[PDB]
Design an enzyme around this catalytic site. Structure first.
Site, PDB file in Angstrom:
ATOM      1  N   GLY A   1     -78.688 -26.564 -57.857  1.00  0.00           N
ATOM      2  CA  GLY A   1     -78.631 -26.422 -56.400  1.00  0.00           C
ATOM      3  C   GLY A   1     -79.815 -27.031 -55.668  1.00  0.00           C
ATOM      4  O   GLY A   1     -80.757 -27.522 -56.290  1.00  0.00           O
ATOM      5  N   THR A   2     -79.764 -26.983 -54.337  1.00  0.00           N
ATOM      6  CA  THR A   2     -80.828 -27.531 -53.493  1.00  0.00           C
ATOM      7  C   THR A   2     -82.059 -26.630 -53.530  1.00  0.00           C
ATOM      8  O   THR A   2     -81.983 -25.479 -53.956  1.00  0.00           O
ATOM      9  CB  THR A   2     -80.384 -27.702 -52.022  1.00  0.00           C
ATOM     10  N   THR A   3     -83.191 -27.158 -53.074  1.00  0.00           N
ATOM     11  CA  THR A   3     -84.451 -26.418 -53.116  1.00  0.00           C
ATOM     12  C   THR A   3     -84.539 -25.408 -51.966  1.00  0.00           C
ATOM     13  O   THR A   3     -84.228 -25.730 -50.820  1.00  0.00           O
ATOM     14  CB  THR A   3     -85.666 -27.370 -53.063  1.00  0.00           C
TER      15      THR A   3
END
Ligand SMILES: [Cl-]
Lengths: 243, 111, 250, 195, 231, 244, 240, 235, 241
Positions: free
Chosen positions: A29-31
């Site tokens: 996933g994204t940060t």
């Protein structure tokens, strides 16, 4: 072998491979990050712009629980929403019975026990998210991070997602260089920088920055989104540091 | 003891013409010897060229109209936007009323 | 959630074997030796207190348990399974008998109730069989003294004397030579201590052995006076000292 | 409904039941048969609250007929009466009890004996040489106590029954519109068409 | 492979194969386009027939006077999800006298789809939805995936060959967003967008399906000779 | 989920057999032999206890022969624990019937009820069947003396003489050879013991390895008596018939 | 509760559990049904592997559902009892609610529906039973004969057989039974039913059961001697 | 084993796709819609000559204005027909009117996907639902176990479906009469059937606005078969 | 080989899922120790905060179950907290129903019974934790009772749990072999804590700072945990003799 085909099965190591596979979805996933400041907390997240057709500032990722808790997560977004829906039910029943808004450590265990319950049976799947959350209560500011296993701890700074290593390194510098502490407005600026620095791991597509914060002095201990001039000021500070 | 029913007064009148129909009603709403409102609409356009008024206990009246208006909406969804005929609306309302046979809507209704 | 294991986990194999029951019996075989001997005026049940650590207080772990004032139990196999069976056995003696008839159940019928619970874990959905064999000694007015064995299948058999667990084959042979229908309780205790010494490796004393009897009524252990018909429990657990005294005349 | 009588003689059981049905102030029917055949040699007459009577009778009938088919065997009058009693004793503590009183007239083919059972709506069963429900017994039992013998013929039983009906017709305020009479014996059940 | 037998099982790389297979059913489905301006929102759908004797499967479903969607994939699953939306829109009106916000409608669909991806016995929904609507914050367009992911967009397309229409909208972004107070021109842009996904077949009178909602325009569906104007 | 671990106890084989029923019958074929013989003036139930010990308390022991009511008894072959579950259900059914109709339950009706319970475990519920075969010995005033058997499939049949458990093939042949319709109880007692003595896997047939019972109208006038034989009484009948 | 789907489709579009239930029927003893002009006869095979049997008390193969309808079967015996009980309950339930006895077609439709339900309900397996249902409708003199099977399909037959070696006896019936002129009397109908079983049975002793059902609830089961006379007459004509 | 509601890698439900294979093994059923009415015809396919063919009921009345033909595991259809009849009559109770053919079909199709681990498997039968209402006139629907239903001008289901459908492709036009449709069903049934078509092994039916749903007598169908033979021999 | 996935018997009469739950117990790589004084019961555990971003005050494996009862856990924190929440609920329910404080040994037995159920019922997995309960019981005095994933439990004079439990166990065994008593003959709890730390240092062969340890103390009518500064005072006293 076959120990990794079913949830809640101990491998000969004593490991639950299904939970470890859920962590892989989180790492994909994204940060997203969290920063504990002097009298509150700041949350920030990387939103990948998959296409120009995405409406800017509309697909909001950070979620509020009650009026004093902020939640952000990386991994399977629907799983995160499900966890926040439960968190809202837990917070409501606490306030219903005890009157006072749910303390952050109390809230942390409510999420922790619920996530841990999804590692006890083969009829359910573990959560595909790591959740960073926190806020201000009677005892002050608290920041937490919760993993697919149900494991959680308190944090000075927290990071998860694809750019977590980069983020963690940046957070460790702030802890060392500011033992006396960080202000809420500083934390917002630093949060912007860290997301921009962590974007090197997702450098193919451009992104949108989203920040929120709870602070005793700046927001009266309520969760609010960083908007307009204060957001732009943080974006400018972040862009200046990468160049 | 709690009395779940009340009387909000009011009077309604329906007359069928050769190629038209009228549904009239006064706008006064009352309890006992007091006036609640001098203008509280009682006759409603429910769509599909049907008008309706549920006179008596206003809370039950508003509930029935609200449920019938809802029944018209779902009739369109379920049957390809077909117009609900007055005879079909009438039969539908019978079943709305009889669902509470043992705790009735306290209203006299005209469409 | 919900328990979605509504199907049997114990099933017949092509050869007609019930695997999980056989495997439960294997777990019982690995367990520490326990035995029971019936005398004319009493019954004795005994086992070794196999302490897991010397720092552990083995007095707090009771392998021999009171079920009713006149009925006692001992086991071989998995301890935790035994502990929960004792809890259920104590309760069922009240719910399915004492609260109906106003008296404690006879040995054979309490055994029958315990057996039923163990049979159900052999057929019901989403459970394994109990990994224990029980030896239940007891007394009641109309049947006198009795000793029963209960296996993981739920089957139970009455014995004059028997042994279960680790060295049961050798112990049963030892008991066959010594047992007769004229034994007094003290003679049975003596034989129990002799039989149990063969299966014990290390220390053999009152602190490493657990032994109880079903014998005469103990009015001193009743806790109250004033009712002639109430004369006290027949179950009594022998003390560490009482065991050592009989080990000198061994 | 109103009137049901029963008498057990030497070789048969005779049941007499009124024909009237009243709704409000009007007699709707004067030919109603207040009885159901439970099995070839077992007859049940009934009286009580409106509706409940027929409902209960037909429910019992269905259960006995089901038993007969399942076992290819007729239950004894005693067995049927016990089943009926249990259903009424079950019913009296229900949310809404069945307000029905019955007489069960049967011929036991095994023992070669007629049998009459009286059961009220509470589930109170008694085996009797003659019986009745409601107020019927108040008028008729004195005649039965006087004239009844256990060795009576069916014809003598009918004559004593006529005397009972005549006394009822004289001293009862209600017009019950006569009775339908049925006889239960070794050959089965038959109706007396002239009474 | 070994981890695609049910929805309750992650793969070693953290993937949910049953959800991915459900996503595949959408790609097999016929193309449908969504786009909006500041005043109106438009759905355009290419309907699919079984053969020449058969009718063309309906693609667009009305949820309320101010909201509706188009489908691509398993049609019965769209009926279930649209029925749920109808009920939720209706609960909002009856209880709160409030038209259901399009953004909240997306959140409800996400949560309903999610429950089917985490529990044993069930299955994910096998359909993708494009929801349009006009509420208190203006016109809206949403894209629903049965993974649970819901996204607010200016324009998009789903189904077979949808990449062609999606690229066109990505070029035309600055033009069609400005088409305010002109429903016909906004539909034209949508019809031109869906045309980029056609091969061999072209837009006929019983092939094309269009829907529109706006400022003073209730959600209405156009089929048959009503869309001949735009062919 | 849980499906992975389900053995599926209630399914057909490709040949149209019920796996678990067949395997349960295989289990029963290793159990001690039980024999039932019906005569004109009574019924005999004989059964062999499995490899016993000298330290087993026989006089208080019961593994084969059980009393359902005053008129009906059963001989067991298979898992004893499974049998006791069913036996207690049958005892209750008999009392339910008696309470309802005020008459003792006909033998077949009791047998059918137990057999229907067995059937259910083969068709629904996902549970293993009862590994038990019964021989029912009983009396009622409709059919008189009756012998039935039931097995894990829930199928039941009536018999003049029958065996269950081990060596039934050999046992049934011996019974079929010496049985006659005009036979009496005392003769049937002898036949039952002689059949066990020839089919037994043990070296010799002794009193301590047997359970025995009779149902006789040999009760004072028109009534039926059940006799569960005591160890000493089994020892005497073994000497009388000339086996020991 | 146990909800496991046991009856499911296979890649080739077959429900194997239903098909394996038919194999259980194939194993069962032979049953045959023949309808004459004014009657129906049900014949049933009794396997002679079981002697020392008590024929008084042993469950008979033909069961009365009501006074005017009968049911025979082939397959699992225990399974058949459940269908028979349900059928008997429904028969009394129909009389109670509609005041007419069931028609043979209705009773068949109900039993067939029960069988079907057990092919798409969770946690249950199909009945390993096929039935022959025969009788006469109330106040009707036209004979009725129906067949059901595990899948739940049913149909009417002029003559039909089920069970082991049913292929052979159906072969016999197809060439011997004339539709234009069915067995005019009870004798002819019974004779044809016994003849058909003699193709498969082995010995004509206690292996053949015959049950004759006539109009107006006239049902009787033939004895050993009565059947033995048919067996004698058939073979004496055959010696030519 | 595997879930009953499992998706394949191609995005199809295994069980639904397998039930479609069972329908391919079923006897042929054909439906043709015209402006004068809708015709429904089926292959009876008796397994033996002793089976009384008139007891084979593969064409069924749902209401006076709606008929239905089936193909596949026909036992599965009984609960679907029962639901359809109940839905049709219940709507008449609630709304004092006939129910739309599409609405009836939609109600039947709502049952289709109610399976899992509700019923244990999908239906193994396809239905041709034909009828008439005032809004959309004469209609023919094909209801599958997938929960999908298509409207058709003409449709064939069962074992000879793809061959029959190709034939219906060429023969159907918007000006067909009822008589022409009747002969057309008989013609195509005769083409795909194994045994020779006659009045005993094939059945016709129709739905008209005036007379409603009617199953044809064997005498009436026999004449239409004789009329077919003569017109084919005419050229 | 599905007998290794759920809690059913293997052919050897073993429960592999229970055995693997024991192995999960050492996943944290932490060692705990418990000893009894005259008036008190002391429990010490290693504290390891590997990440600088962590708030070290929230990192704990010692739990205050009730006022009298403390619990230290050896195993992963999610299961540890699961067990902690349940024990707190049970202890509170006990007091409400029976009118007195739940004893340490009774709570241990209750949690052991719950663990036993997970070894017998298939749908529930064992918790990968070992639970050491401590108190000063009003009847039995200083008490240590330990529960494991098998559902086994027993009282202890002293005990140790973790990867290096054997080294600590033998060290404690040798001390009690000398003194010939079942406890630490000491008046103040401060000195009992000093004993506990000293003998863990000797057994493990490692020195400890104030942030390397975690300490719990049970006295009459209360259980409490020590702060870092309280532990520092304890470490200073050890070094000064
Ligand atoms: Cl407990």
């Amino acid at each position: 072998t076959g120990y990794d085909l079913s949830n809640s099965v101990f491998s000969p190591d004593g490991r639950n491979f299904q939970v470890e596979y859920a962590v892989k979805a989180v790492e994909n996933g994204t940060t997203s990050i969290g920063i504990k400041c002097n009298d509150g907390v700041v949350f920030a997240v990387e939103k990948l712009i998959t296409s120009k057709l995405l409406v800017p500032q509309k697909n909001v990722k950070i979620q509020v629980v009650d009026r004093h808790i902020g939640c952000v997560y990386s991994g399977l977004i629907p799983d995160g929403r499900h966890l926040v829906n439960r968190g809202r039910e837990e917070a409501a029943s606490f306030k219903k019975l005890y009157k006072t808004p749910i303390p952050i450590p109390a809230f942390a265990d409510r999420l922790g026990q619920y996530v841990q319950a999804h590692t006890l049976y083969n009829s359910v799947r573990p959560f595909g998210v790591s959740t960073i959350f926190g806020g201000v209560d009677k005892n002050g500011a608290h920041l937490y991070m919760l993993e697919p296993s149900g494991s959680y701890w308190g944090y000075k700074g927290a990071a998860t997602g694809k750019g977590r290593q980069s983020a963690k390194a940046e957070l460790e510098k702030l802890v060392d260089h500011h033992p006396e502490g960080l202000s809420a407005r500083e934390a917002v600026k630093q949060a912007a920088k860290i997301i921009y620095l962590a974007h090197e791991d997702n450098k193919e597509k451009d992104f949108e920055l989203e920040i929120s914060w709870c602070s005793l002095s700046e927001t009266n201990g309520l969760h609010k989104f960083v908007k307009g001039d204060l957001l732009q000021e943080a974006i400018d500070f972040a862009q200046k540091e990468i160049n | 003891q709690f009395n779940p029913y009340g009387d909000n007064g009011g009077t309604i009148l329906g007359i069928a013409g050769e190629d038209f129909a009228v549904l009239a009603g006064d706008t006064r709403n009352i309890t006992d010897y007091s006036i609640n409102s001098r203008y509280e609409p009682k006759v409603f356009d429910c769509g599909d060229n049907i008008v309706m008024s549920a006179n008596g206990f206003a809370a039950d009246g508003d509930a029935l109209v609200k449920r019938f208006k809802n029944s018209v909406k779902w009739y369109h969804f379920d049957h390809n936007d077909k117009k609900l005929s007055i005879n079909s609306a009438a039969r539908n309302i019978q079943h709305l009323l009889y669902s509470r046979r043992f705790f009735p809507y306290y209203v006299y209704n005209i469409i | 959630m919900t328990d979605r294991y509504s199907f049997s986990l114990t099933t017949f194999s092509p050869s007609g074997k019930l695997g999980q029951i056989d495997y439960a019996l294997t777990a019982v075989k690995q367990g520490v030796t326990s035995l029971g001997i019936k005398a004319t005026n009493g019954v004795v049940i005994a086992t070794e207190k196999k302490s897991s650590s010397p720092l552990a207080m083995s007095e707090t772990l009771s392998k021999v348990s009171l079920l009713t004032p006149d009925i006692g139990a001992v086991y071989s196999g998995m301890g935790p399974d035994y502990r929960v069976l004792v809890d259920k056995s104590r309760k069922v003696a009240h719910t399915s008998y004492k609260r109906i008839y106003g008296e404690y159940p006879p040995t054979k019928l309490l055994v029958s109730e315990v057996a039923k619970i163990m049979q159900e874990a052999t057929q019901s959905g989403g459970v394994r069989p109990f990994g224990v064999s029980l030896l239940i000694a007891g007394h009641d007015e109309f049947n006198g003294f009795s000793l029963y064995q209960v296996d993981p299948s739920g089957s139970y058999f009455p014995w004059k004397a028997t042994a279960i667990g680790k060295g049961s084959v050798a112990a049963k042979t030892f008991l066959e030579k010594r047992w007769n229908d004229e034994l007094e309780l003290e003679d049975a205790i003596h034989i129990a201590l002799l039989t149990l010494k063969e299966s014990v490796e290390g220390e053999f004393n009152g602190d490493t052995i657990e032994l109880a009897i079903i014998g005469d009524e103990n009015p001193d252990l009743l806790g109250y006076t004033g009712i002639p018909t109430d004369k006290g429990p027949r179950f009594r657990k022998l003390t560490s000292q009482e065991i050592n005294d009989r080990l000198e005349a061994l | 409904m109103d009137i049901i009588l029963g008498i057990r003689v030497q070789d048969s059981v005779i049941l007499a039941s009124s024909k009237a049905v009243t709704r409000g102030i009007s007699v709707l029917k004067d030919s109603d048969d207040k009885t159901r055949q439970l099995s070839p040699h077992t007859l049940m007459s009934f009286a009580g609250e409106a509706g409940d009577t027929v409902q209960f009778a037909e429910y019992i009938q269905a259960n006995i007929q089901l038993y007969s088919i399942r076992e290819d065997y007729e239950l004894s009058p005693q067995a049927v009466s016990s089943f009926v009693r249990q259903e009424l004793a079950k019913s009296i503590r229900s949310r809404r009890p069945y307000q029905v009183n019955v007489l069960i007239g049967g011929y036991d083919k095994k023992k070669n004996k007629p049998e009459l059972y009286q059961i009220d709506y509470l589930g109170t069963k008694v085996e009797l040489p003659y019986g009745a429900h409601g107020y019927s017994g108040f008028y008729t039992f004195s005649l039965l106590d006087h004239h009844y013998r256990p060795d009576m013929t069916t014809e003598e039983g009918l004559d004593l029954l006529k005397l009972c009906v005549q006394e009822l017709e004289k001293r009862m305020p209600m017009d019950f519109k006569g009775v339908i009479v049925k006889i239960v014996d070794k050959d089965g059940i038959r109706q007396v068409d002239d009474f | 492979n070994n981890y695609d037998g049910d929805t309750v099982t992650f793969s070693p790389t953290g993937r949910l194969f049953q959800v991915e297979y459900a996503l595949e059913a959408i790609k097999q489905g016929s193309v449908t386009v969504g786009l909006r301006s500041n005043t109106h929102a438009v759905l355009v759908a290419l309907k699919r027939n079984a053969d020449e004797l058969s009718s063309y499967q309906k693609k667009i479903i009305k949820c309320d006077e101010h909201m509706g969607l188009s489908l691509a994939g398993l049609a019965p699953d769209a009926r279930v999800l649209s029925n749920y939306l109808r009920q939720q829109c209706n609960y909002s009106s009856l209880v709160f006298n409030r038209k259901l916000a399009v953004e909240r409608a997306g959140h409800l669909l996400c949560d309903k789809a999610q429950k089917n991806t985490q529990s044993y016995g069930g299955r994910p929904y096998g359909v993708g939805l494009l929801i349009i609507g006009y509420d208190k914050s203006g016109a809206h367009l949403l894209e629903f995936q049965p993974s649970g992911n819901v996204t607010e967009l200016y324009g998009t397309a789903i189904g077979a060959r949808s990449q062609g229409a999606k690229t066109y909208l990505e070029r035309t972004l600055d033009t069609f967003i400005k088409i305010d107070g002109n429903p016909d021109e906004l539909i034209k842009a949508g019809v031109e967008a869906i045309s980029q996904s056609l091969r061999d077949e072209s837009l006929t009178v019983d092939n094309l399906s269009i829907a529109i909602v706006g400022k003073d325009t209730p959600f209405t569906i156009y089929d048959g000779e009503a869309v001949a104007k735009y062919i | 989920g849980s499906r992975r671990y389900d053995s599926r106890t209630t399914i057909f084989s490709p040949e149209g057999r019920l796996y678990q029923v067949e395997y349960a019958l295989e289990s029963i074929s290793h159990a001690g032999t039980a024999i039932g013989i019906m005569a004109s003036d009574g019924i005999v139930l004989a059964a062999e206890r499995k490899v016993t010990s000298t330290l087993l308390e026989q006089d208080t022991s019961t593994e084969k022969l059980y009393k359902l009511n005053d008129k009906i008894a059963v001989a067991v072959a298979g898992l004893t624990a499974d049998a006791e579950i069913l036996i207690n259900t049958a005892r209750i059914h008999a009392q339910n019937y008696l309470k309802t109709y005020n008459e003792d339950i006909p033998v077949e009706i009791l047998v059918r009820r137990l057999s229907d319970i067995k059937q259910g475990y083969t068709q629904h519920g996902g549970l293993r069947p009862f590994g038990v075969s019964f021989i029912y010995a009983g009396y009622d005033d409709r059919y008189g003396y009756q012998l039935y058997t039931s097995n894990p499939s829930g199928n039941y049949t009536g018999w003049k003489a029958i065996s269950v458990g081990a060596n039934t093939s050999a046992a049934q042949t011996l019974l079929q050879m010496d049985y006659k319709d005009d036979m009496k109880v005392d003769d049937a007692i002898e036949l039952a013991l002689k059949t066990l003595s020839k089919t037994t896997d043990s070296s010799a047939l002794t009193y301590d390895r047997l359970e025995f019972a009779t149902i006789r109208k040999g009760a004072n006038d028109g009534e039926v008596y059940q006799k569960i034989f005591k160890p000493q009484e089994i020892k005497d009948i073994l000497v009388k018939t000339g086996i020991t | 509760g146990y909800d496991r789907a046991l009856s499911i489709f296979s890649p080739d579009g077959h429900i194997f559990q239903v098909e394996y239930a038919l194999e259980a029927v194939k194993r069962g003893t032979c049953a045959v049904g023949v309808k004459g002009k004014n009657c129906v006869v049900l014949g049933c095979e009794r396997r002679s592997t079981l002697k020392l049997q008590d024929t008084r008390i042993t469950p008979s193969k033909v069961s009365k559902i009501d006074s005017h309808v009968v049911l025979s079967f082939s397959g699992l015996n225990a399974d058949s009892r459940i269908l028979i009980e349900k059928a008997r309950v429904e028969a009394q339930s129909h009389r109670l609610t509609l005041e007419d006895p069931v028609t043979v077609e209705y009773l068949t439709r109900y039993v067939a529906g029960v069988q079907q339900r057990y092919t798409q309900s969770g946690g249950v397996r199909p009945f390993g039973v096929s039935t022959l249902i025969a009788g006469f409708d109330p106040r009707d003199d036209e004979p009725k004969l129906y067949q059901t099977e595990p899948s739940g399909i049913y149909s009417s037959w002029s003559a039909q057989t089920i069970g082991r070696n049913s292929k052979t006896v159906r072969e016999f019936l197809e060439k011997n039974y004339d539709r234009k002129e069915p067995p005019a009397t009870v004798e002819e109908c019974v004779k044809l039913t016994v003849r058909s079983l003699l193709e498969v049975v082995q010995t004509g002793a206690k292996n053949i059961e015959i049950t004759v059902v006539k109009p107006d609830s006239d049902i009787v089961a033939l004895s050993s001697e009565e059947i033995n006379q048919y067996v004698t007459q058939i073979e004496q004509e055959k010696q030519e | 084993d595997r879930g009953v509601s499992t998706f394949s890698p191609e995005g199809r439900l295994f069980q639904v796709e397998y039930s479609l294979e069972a329908i391919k093994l079923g006897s042929t059923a054909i439906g043709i819609a015209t402006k004068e009415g809708v015709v429904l015809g089926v292959e009876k396919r008796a397994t033996s000559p002793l089976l009384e063919s008139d007891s084979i009921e593969k064409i069924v009345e749902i209401d006076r204005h709606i008929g239905c033909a089936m193909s596949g595991l026909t036992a599965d259809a009984r609960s679907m027909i029962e639901h359809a009849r109940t839905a049709a009559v219940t709507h008449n109770l609630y709304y004092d009117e006939d129910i739309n053919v599409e609405s009836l079909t939609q109600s039947v199709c709502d049952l289709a996907l109610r399976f899992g681990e509700l019923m244990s498997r999908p239906f193994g039968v396809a239905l041709l639902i034909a009828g008439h209402d005032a809004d959309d006139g004469y209609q023919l629907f094909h209801a599958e176990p997938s929960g999908t239903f298509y409207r058709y001008n003409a449709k064939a289901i069962g074992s000879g479906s793809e061959g029959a459908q190709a034939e219906l492709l060429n023969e159907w036009h918007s000006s067909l009469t009822l008589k022409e449709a009747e002969l057309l069903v008989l013609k195509i049934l005769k083409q795909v059937m194994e045994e020779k078509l006659d009045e005993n092994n094939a059945q016709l039916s129709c739905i008209t606005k005036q007379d409603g749903f009617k199953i044809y007598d064997n005498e009436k169908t026999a004449e239409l078969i004789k009329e077919l033979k003569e017109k084919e021999a005419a050229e | 080989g599905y007998d290794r996935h759920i809690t059913i018997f293997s052919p050897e009469g073993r429960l592999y899922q229970v055995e693997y739950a024991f192995k999960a117990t050492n996943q944290t790589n932490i060692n705990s120790l418990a000893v009894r004084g005259k008036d008190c019961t002391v429990v010490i555990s290693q504290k390891k905060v590997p990440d600088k971003l962590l708030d070290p005050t929230t990192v704990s494996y010692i739990f205050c179950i009730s006022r009298t009862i403390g619990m230290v856990v050896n195993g992963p924190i999610p299961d540890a907290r699961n067990a902690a929440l349940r024990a707190k609920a049970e202890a509170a329910e006990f007091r409400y129903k029976y009118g007195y404080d739940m004893p340490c040994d009774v709570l241990a037995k209750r949690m052991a019974n719950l663990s036993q159920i997970y070894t017998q019922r298939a749908y529930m997995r064992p918790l990968g934790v070992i639970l050491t309960f401590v108190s000063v019981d009003e009847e039995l005095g200083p008490s240590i009772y330990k529960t494991d994933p098998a559902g086994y439990y027993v009282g202890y004079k002293a005990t140790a749990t973790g990867p290096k439990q054997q080294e600590i166990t033998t060290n404690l065994e040798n001390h009690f072999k000398k003194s010939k008593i079942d406890h630490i003959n000491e008046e103040s709890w401060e000195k009992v804590v000093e004993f506990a730390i000293t003998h863990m240092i000797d057994a493990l062969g490692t020195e400890f700072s104030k942030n390397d340890l975690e300490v719990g103390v049970a006295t009459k009518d209360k259980f409490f945990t020590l702060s870092a500064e309280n532990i520092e005072e304890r470490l200073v006293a050890i070094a000064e003799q």
